[PDB]
Each structure stands twice: as structure tokens, then as C-alpha cells.
Design a protein around this ligand. Structure first.
Ligand SMILES: *[C@@](O)(c1noc(Cc2ccc(OCCc3ccc(Cl)c(Cl)c3)cc2)n1)[C@H](CCCCN)NC(=O)c1ccc(F)cc1
Ligand SMILES: *[C@@](O)(c1noc(Cc2ccc(OCCc3ccc(Cl)c(Cl)c3)cc2)n1)[C@H](CCCCN)NC(=O)c1ccc(F)cc1
Ligand SMILES: *[C@@](O)(c1noc(Cc2ccc(OCCc3ccc(Cl)c(Cl)c3)cc2)n1)[C@H](CCCCN)NC(=O)c1ccc(F)cc1
Ligand SMILES: *[C@@](O)(c1noc(Cc2ccc(OCCc3ccc(Cl)c(Cl)c3)cc2)n1)[C@H](CCCCN)NC(=O)c1ccc(F)cc1
Lengths: 243, 243, 243, 243
């Protein structure tokens, strides 16, 4: 996370850390608990190539990475079949846990938005994770969960910005309709925030608008953060995850 | 180049090295001389973001990088306007030299194929360059120009291979119609060969079939090298380069 | 620590972590609390070149580095004036804290040996710290304090081992009389344990025999860990530290 | 080499490159040809631990590293038996080639100084090699042999400078009597120049005064370059090398 602050312990009870087997169980991406048995993440965290499920675990909400790990094994990785790269789109995946988790006020699911919600500019939205605090700058120990409030911008505005300082023709769409844009040169997600949630408070409910997907660096001029637009993939999610 | 050998001095008179300003004029990509004043390369070498022409030079055929440099300034970079990433496609660009080169038997142009030419599967073609000799393995000093014979593979077969061990749906195209495929787990192009030529000898003439574009690593199982299909972009090339 | 285990919370109440100012207060060396206002460490941690006291802090015993830091400022660095390199010797230094520590069962001082004490070969001693777990292998998060039992070895035997597979003449001393030797190819101290204590239980009391100094890598054949011999420098320590 | 310039082809016919077996025969130290069968270098380049001779070769003078290699195998490595570290001293070694080389005006031996020559300040002296051009700054391709004129300073002056900004007591000698000091903040040897020659022209003959040994970084304030003093080790050299 670029800008923002350490999250209060009572905020973001759906935040998860994805861990890869190595010298230790290392954080490589975020996710969100959308069901006691299901984690929502980015496809680019777990694909497009098929990996050994034994090499993956999930960690539920931790204030500080690694200090109190209780790792959960995964039974299934489901990756959107249209996914190949984040810039092409369909950057969305599901992890099925081997067992349902016990939910509480400290650890519980995020609400998915209804199909009609567009998340226009001036919506209050937050992105959370344990990623880099700037381009090529690691989150230092003790690895506190960060949050930052990011301004939403309309896709067409964001598309026009991505074309400034580029050879790409103005008519060749960069920011696609299954994507959502937020952030500026002080407030963004960064490497290690991938797969984590962008959440907006709508009529007193926290809704997941986005999955951290991609950008040209982090907090760079005319290069806002890009997110998988959750409303676009509700029917695909609801094929796997009970309502 | 993976699984290659050092090129004879008399072969590949069209090979060029692209150089970026730093502590020295470092090789970052290949190219081909298609006209005395024009170099053909990959868009991803020089875009999609706009670069300073002052930081770029061209070096014509060298047996060993850096030994006998005579660096040429570039007057214009023309990146295909449909280019954003190599996986989306249109991975092709033109460098206009500030002066035409005086051609010789040692340094001269490659022939572009006719629009009709379909380089059939199995045909023996060659790819050349000063790139890595394996995944994350640098070409050692003294940096000899390398060559490897790579068989052409039909797009449908190559697309099918990229789907093996992948979550991507079989009906979702990975290798697109403006791309061409060559190589196996012993013979491939690699990082630093980007923008360089894939050449095939047809009716006793060397024709440039491909521009080194992308792949999943180098010489990996079921991940052949992907190239920009030159026949696809002949009308765009001929818009700038005299016939 | 090589071949160790995580320390019980009740053990090694004198262990300290030395911290340098940067993007965070990073652990670079160990130390021991020998008096409420004094830390014993290696000269090579803090010399021979003069450093800014503002850039140094001390952290008293913590089970996991960085998690619950309470960083203590240092009023003075005293590096033995005969120190230039660890292999020459006098690898010993004192940090004077700005305030005396309030001692407890969890955090308190280690006992210095009497001048006469000869820690005989084969005696069970312990070395502790947050250093590497093998050659160029970092302690993973969450950075637990580690411990390993290492047998004391006679200087003459240790000197003889350093000469095996070396050009150095057998009559040319490598392990000097102000040094002490411990460890084998399964059990050693390593990079980041420097300045930490080697403690031995004598007549029911923990005595500090050694300060982690140097070696040829960690746990290498015929290259035991070398330590500053504390008994050798008692008169220098007691010049500054009340008895 | 810090400061100075590329050496003319006609200068330093005694300069040698030491090569270690890896992905390529990589330069790690310099040397000097003192006899058709013998190379003079630093002990720290080849010791104190015994290595496999098959992993070492010698390259005689080349203007550009790697471009025209004709590598020579070594029959013997002879390291001063008093050597353990450069700062302790006796930083001197001999390589015996398997065959005598053919000498010419382009490749020939350097003259050793007579026992009485002290090399006082104001002597014109040069140091040569393919080492770093500044602290952690590699010689760029094409790796030209560099030279720099370095001012000699008296041992006592150099010893006093090494004490400025240090804890080491003023009467604890750092610069030892078997060592020689040259350089300033514009002109020095650096990492990769180790084992190479410091040569001074005395009564129209080039004499090797020094072997590149050590320093605190390169061209740093109050830290001139330190060399093994060749006159100190003449009797040891003459045990092995014919006059
Ligand atoms: C994401 O934070 C991000 N950062 O890096 C990535 C890519 C990445 C890196 C490592 C891994 O490790 C997977 C290991 C593994 C092993 C075994 C098993 Cl079984 C499994 Cl499942 C996994 C995966 C993925 N993603 C950032 C966010 C940027 C936000 C900018 N505002 N995204 C990118 O860096 C990025 C992604 C894709 C792009 F096309 C461009 C940029
Ligand atoms: C290509 O060999 C390759 N290798 O690296 C690249 C990417 C790359 C990296 C650096 C640069 O630097 C140019 C910077 C610069 C600065 C100043 C100025 Cl003025 C200019 Cl013009 C430019 C450019 C490009 N490409 C390989 C080939 C793989 C072959 C496999 N068989 N391709 C990739 O590595 C690759 C490219 C694109 C992708 F989407 C994936 C993979
Ligand atoms: C020690 O564990 C060790 N590990 O690294 C060292 C060297 C070292 C590296 C960095 C620093 O940082 C000091 C920075 C600093 C900045 C500001 C301020 Cl204000 C201050 Cl005071 C300081 C210090 C020291 N030492 C190991 C133990 C090996 C045990 C093997 N059995 N020792 C070595 O690595 C070693 C030391 C000396 C040698 F000559 C050789 C080897
Ligand atoms: C020297 O230029 C220098 N630079 O690095 C060294 C140390 C060094 C590095 C690599 C190797 O390779 C060993 C490979 C090998 C493999 C097989 C076989 Cl068979 C053999 Cl024989 C060898 C060896 C040694 N030395 C610089 C010069 C500094 C000049 C400052 N004005 N010296 C140092 O960096 C240095 C040496 C010793 C010190 F105590 C401090 C500094």
C-alpha cells in the first residue's frame, strides 16, 4: 500500500494473505473471505499455469504478517477460463478451503455488490494489504496490514490517462470494461497487494468493488491503479460460491 | 539464444543490436536491417511508453558486442499504434536511422516476405542474437552473436501447447493470428533476443518470417517461442519503408 | 544460529539486539546485558571506524524481532583500542545505555566469569541470537530468538583445524590467546549472531565465556566458530563496568 | 582502477589476469609476469584455503578482457606461509605455469627492485588492472586495461591517516612495515585490481614496488591504497624463482 496507514485491528475482517511454500510460508498476494469456504483473489496470483495445491496456504486476518500464523490448506483453485494476462482481463480466481472457517466479529466475510452498482467517482473506497509501500520498497517488519483511501475515477478518464506519454492509439482501449480504476500519485496499491480487496461503503454496508490487478508501477503520474470489476464476474462467482 | 552456437562472421549481415545510454551503451534488444535507413524490431523493446531518442543507438552486425562499436543515432521510433503488450499483439516497431548505411557483403538488408508467403510447419528457420543462453543465464563475455535452427509450428498447435498445464479455456486464444511460433525444449530465443529476426531460406533467398516477441520463459515444455508474424504487418511496414 | 532451535521465553534474559537506523531499525548484531546500564558486544559490530550514536539503538530480550520493540538509546560506544580486525583480535566493545534497565525474571544481566575460570574442552555451552540459519540463509519471519549447544574446544586444537586445507604455516598462529573456539559442522553461530553471548553453566551459575567474533563461514568442516575470550578482557571491562 | 585512463597497447607488458572456472573463465585478480614460468600475485587472491589448480588459469597481457583469451594452466600455487589476512600482512603468492611463455616486446617480465630501494614520496608510480572504476562500480565492457599514476606516501603518514575517524589506538600500527601506501581521493586501485602491480620508473627501469593488497574502500578520504612491499619478500621470491 502507498500512502495511508496501519489498519485498526477492528477493520477489514475479510482480508487474507496467500502463502507459497519455501524457506518459510511467504506472502505473495492478498485475497478476501467471501464465504466461510471461499477466498476471492486475482487469477494472476495463481495462474494461468496450474500449480501444486500443496505449495499454497491461506492465512486469515493478521495485524502483523507471520507473527501468529495458523495456515489453512486449499482443496481447489478455480481460475476464470478467459484469464491469460491482467492487461487482457478476467483477472479473478476463487480458492476453496478444505474446511469452512468459523466466523466472528474479528474474522468474517465481505459482501459482494449487486450487479447494478457502478461505483462512481466520489464513492468512499479503501484498498488494504501487506504490499510494497512504494515502487521497489518492501513493507518493513513487523509487516502491519495497511489501508489507504483511494479516489475512484471513471474508466474513460483512466483510459485517456493511460494513453498520455504512450505510442498506443487513442482508439485502442487500455482500461477495459471488466476493470475499475482508483488512486493517484499519493494513494495506491503496490506489488504484494495483488488479489486483495477494494471496498466501498454503500448505504452503511461494505461492498467489494474491486480485486487489486495491475498498473504501470504504483502511484505514478497519469497511471492510476487498475482493479478487476467484481460486478462483471458475479455470475461466474455464483456458479461456485453459495448465496 | 538457447541451444545455439556462435555464428560464422559471413552469416546474418542484417542483425542489429539496440543500445540504451547508461554507465555504457548496453544491449537490451535485437533488430534487423530491412532497408539502408530502417531497422525492424519489437514494439515492447521501445514502448508502449514514449522514450527519449537521445538515449537510444543502433549497432550494425558485430561478431562480439562492445569490442568494435560504431554507434548510429536514430531519428524516429515508430511503434505500431495497436501495441500495448506482446500477449495482446501488434508487437512491431521501426527505427529510422539518421543516415542510410553503405551496404556490403558483411552488412546488408534482409528481404521481407511477400504477403502470400505461409512459412509451413517443419520448415528450418534461424533466430539470432546476443540474449540469455538459458532462463536467467546471461550470454558470457566476449558476447558472440549466437544462432539456432528452430522449426516453424502451426499457430493452432502452438496455441494448443500454451493451454496444456493452464487454467485458460481451450476456446480462449493465447497465440493470436498476428503471431508465429517456433522452438522446442532444446532450441529457443530468450531475454535479450527480443526484436531480433526469425529468418527462413525460401527459393534460395533469406526471408524474415518473424520478430522475437514473447514466451513463458525459454525452451520450457509446451511453451514454444512466439514471434510477430511479419506477413501480417507488411502493409504497415510498407507505409513507411520504400519497396 | 546454525542447527539450533527457538529459545524458550524464560531462557537467555541477557540477550540483546543491536539496531541501525534505515527504512526500519534493522538488527545487525547481538549483545549481552552485563550490568543494568552496560551491553557487551563485538568491536567489529560498531568499529573500527567511528559511527553516529543517533543511528544506534538497543532492544532487550524479545522472543520475535520487530514485533514489540522498545528501542533504547546508547550514550557511549567503547571499542577496545587494540581492535582493528577480528582475526588480529581484541574484538570486544561496551555500549553504555542512557538509563539503567529495571531488571526482572524475564530481562536481567549475565554473570562475567572470574579471571581464573578455564572453560575446559567438551563443556556444554550455548550461543544464542537472530543470525543466519546457514551460509547466506536468513533467519525467516517471524525471527524467533534461536539457541544451540556447542562444545568448547581447546585453542591449540582449533588453531590446528584452521591450518588443515590452508597454505598458512603450522607455526603461524590463526586462533590467538585472546580468542576461544566452539562448534562443529552441525552447530555454530553465523552472520547476525556477532557480538552475542556464548554462555556456560558453572557451579549452577550462567557465565559468559565468549563474544561471537568470526569464522570461515558457518558450520564448515575444520572451521569452528571463534569468539572473544571474555576472561582475557575482564580488567578492560571492569575499568568501565562496576563489579 | 579509480581515475586514470585506458593503457596504451605498448605499456605494462607484464600485466596478467587470473581466471576462475564458472559459466566462463572470469577475471578475479591481477598479477605480474616476473619470469617466463612465474606470476607474482596477492596471497588473498588464491588463499589462505587450498583450491583446485584445475579451476585456475592465467591470461597474459590483453588490451580488452575476454576478447582474445589464450588461457595458460598453472602447475603450482605457492602462498607465503605467514599469510592469513591482508591486514595482518605477507599478502604475496607465486603461480608456476605448466610451460615457460615466449617473451616479446608486447609480453615480457617486470624487474624486481633491489633490497635497498625504499620508494619514497615523489617517485612516479603507476598501478594497472581491470578492476572497478569506483566503489561497487564495475569496469564496463569492453573491459580495457586501465592505468593511474598514484602518489606514494610514507608508511608513518598513511598509518596516521588510517587512525583518523577510528577507535583504534594511535600506537596500534595499522599500516605494517611489509606494506606500502599510494593513492588519494582521485587515483586508486579497487576491487578486481588485487594482486596486480604497482610499478615505479627508477634510473630508466620499471621496478615492481608493490602488489595491490587492500584498503578501506577505494579513493576514500584518509584511506590511501595499501600494497604488499615487494622488497620485504625478495628472499622468499628468490627461493622459488630463478635470477
Ligand atoms: C500485485 O501485487 C502483484 N505483485 O506481484 C504480482 C505477480 C506475482 C508474483 C509472485 C507470485 O508468486 C506465486 C507463487 C506460487 C507458487 C505456488 C503456488 Cl501453488 C501458487 Cl498458487 C503460487 C504470483 C504473482 N502481482 C501487483 C499489484 C499492482 C497494483 C498497482 N496499483 N500487480 C502487479 O505487479 C502486476 C500484475 C500483472 C501485470 F500484468 C502487471 C503488474
Ligand atoms: C525479449 O528478449 C526481452 N527481453 O527483455 C524484454 C523486455 C525489455 C526490457 C528492457 C528494455 O529496456 C529498454 C529501455 C529503454 C530505455 C531508453 C530508451 Cl531511449 C529505449 Cl528506446 C528503451 C526493453 C524491453 N524483452 C524476450 C524474448 C523472449 C523470447 C522467448 N522465446 N521477451 C520477453 O522477455 C517478454 C516480452 C514481453 C512479454 F509480455 C513477455 C516476455
Ligand atoms: C557476525 O555475525 C557478523 N555478521 O556481520 C558482521 C559484519 C557487520 C556487518 C554490518 C554491520 O553494521 C554496522 C552498521 C552500523 C551503523 C551505524 C552505527 Cl551508529 C553503528 Cl554502531 C553500526 C556490522 C558488522 N559480523 C559474524 C559471526 C560469525 C560467526 C561464525 N561462527 N561475523 C562475521 O561475519 C565476521 C566478522 C569479522 C570477520 F573478520 C570475518 C567474519
Ligand atoms: C582486490 O582487488 C580484491 N577484490 O576482491 C578481492 C577478494 C577476492 C575475490 C574473489 C576471489 O576469487 C577466488 C576464486 C578462486 C577459485 C579457484 C581457485 Cl583455484 C582460485 Cl586460486 C581462486 C579471490 C579474492 N580482492 C582488492 C584491492 C583493494 C584496493 C584498494 N585500494 N582488495 C580487497 O577488496 C580487499 C582484500 C582484503 C581485505 F582485507 C580488504 C579488501
Amino acid at each position: 500500500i502507498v500512502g495511508g496507514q496501519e489498519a485498526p485491528r477492528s477493520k477489514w475482517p475479510w482480508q487474507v494473505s496467500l502463502r507459497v511454500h519455501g524457506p518459510y510460508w511467504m506472502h505473495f498476494c492478498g485475497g478476501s473471505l467471501i464465504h466461510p469456504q471461499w477466498v476471492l483473489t486475482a487469477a494472476h496470483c495463481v495462474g494461468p499455469d496450474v500449480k501444486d495445491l500443496a505449495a499454497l496456504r491461506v492465512q486469515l486476518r493478521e495485524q502483523h504478517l507471520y507473527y501468529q500464523d495458523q495456515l489453512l490448506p486449499v482443496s481447489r483453485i478455480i481460475v476464470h477460463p478467459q484469464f491469460y494476462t491482467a492487461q487482457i482481463g478476467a483477472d479473478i480466481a476463487l480458492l476453496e478451503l478444505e474446511e469452512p472457517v468459523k466466523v466472528s466479529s474479528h474474522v468474517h466475510t465481505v459482501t459482494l455488490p449487486p450487479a447494478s452498482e457502478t461505483f462512481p467517482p466520489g464513492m468512499p473506497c479503501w484498498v488494504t494489504g501487506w504490499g510494497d509501500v512504494d515502487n521497489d520498497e518492501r513493507l518493513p517488519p513487523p509487516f502491519p496490514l495497511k489501508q489507504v483511501k483511494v479516489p475512484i475515477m471513471e474508466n474513460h478518464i483512466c483510459d485517456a490517462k493511460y494513453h498520455l506519454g504512450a505510442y498506443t492509439g487513442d482508439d485502442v482501449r487500455i482500461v477495459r470494461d471488466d476493470m475499475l480504476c482508483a488512486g493517484n500519485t499519493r494513494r495506491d496499491s503496490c506489488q504484494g497487494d495483488s488479489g486483495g480487496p477494494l471496498v466501498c461503503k454503500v448505504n452503511g454496508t461494505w461492498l467489494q468493488a474491486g480485486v487489486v490487478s495491475w498498473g504501470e508501477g504504483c502511484a505514478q503520474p497519469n497511471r492510476p491503479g487498475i482493479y478487476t470489476r467484481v460486478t462483471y464476474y458475479l455470475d461466474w462467482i455464483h456458479h461456485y460460491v453459495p448465496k
